[PDB]
Amino acid sequence: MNIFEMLRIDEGLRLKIYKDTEGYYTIGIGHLLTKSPSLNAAKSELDKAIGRNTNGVITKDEAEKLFNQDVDAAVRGILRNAKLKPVYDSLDAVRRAALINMVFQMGETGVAGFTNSLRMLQQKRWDEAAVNLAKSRWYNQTPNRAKRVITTFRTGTWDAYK
Numbered sequence: 001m002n003i004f005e006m007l008r009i010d011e012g013l014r015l016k017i018y019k020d021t022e023g024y025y026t027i028g029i030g031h032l033l034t035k036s037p038s039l040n041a042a043k044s045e046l047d048k049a050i051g052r053n054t055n056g057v058i059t060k061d062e063a064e065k066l067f068n069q070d071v072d073a074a075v076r077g078i079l080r081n082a083k084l085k086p087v088y089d090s091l092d093a094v095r096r097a098a099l100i101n102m103v104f105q106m107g108e109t110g111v112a113g114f115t116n117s118l119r120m121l122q123q124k125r126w127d128e129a130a131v132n133l134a135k136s137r138w139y140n141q142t143p144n145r146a147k148r149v150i151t152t153f154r155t156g157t158w159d160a161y162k
């Protein structure tokens with residue numbers, strides 16, 4: 001297991017524009033297009049993202065290309081961020097994947113808001129971080145995903161994904 005396989009499980013793959021859990025236009029492997037209510041705004045972000053006239057449908061190669069870029073962007077946002085970077089550097093390889101997963105889902109600003117959890121993660125107080133991570137809108141809106149990510153921080157193993 002790795003970050004790519006983890007996120008492919010959490011996000012799924014859809015080749016036509018769909019609404020994510022929050023109701024936003026999305027495509028591929030959780031690639032958010034736009035928060036705007038307009039499917040036309042989505043299709044136009046999609047064409048721009050892919051560089052051709054898609055009519056709301058992309059191929060598997062194209063979905064995987066966006067995914068690679070989004071994982072790369074998630075990692076680069078962690079390393080550019082003064083709150084996230086020291087936490088990431090302190091973690092082992094499996095728990096690093098859990099942090100990336102969270103940033104992918106909710107963005108660098110959102111995760112940087114988990115001030116208390118991040119401090120517990122840095123201190124390696126795994127059971128306490130897991131409890132605090134769960135007291136969140138994130139956990140209450142997407143409990144199955146959040147549980148798998150929290151388990152990963154708690155144990156440092158891929159057990160929630162096998």
Ligand SMILES: [Cl-]
Nearest residue numbers: 048049066069
């Ligand atoms: Cl893009």
Ligand SMILES: [Cl-]
Nearest residue numbers: 142143144145
């Ligand atoms: Cl979920």
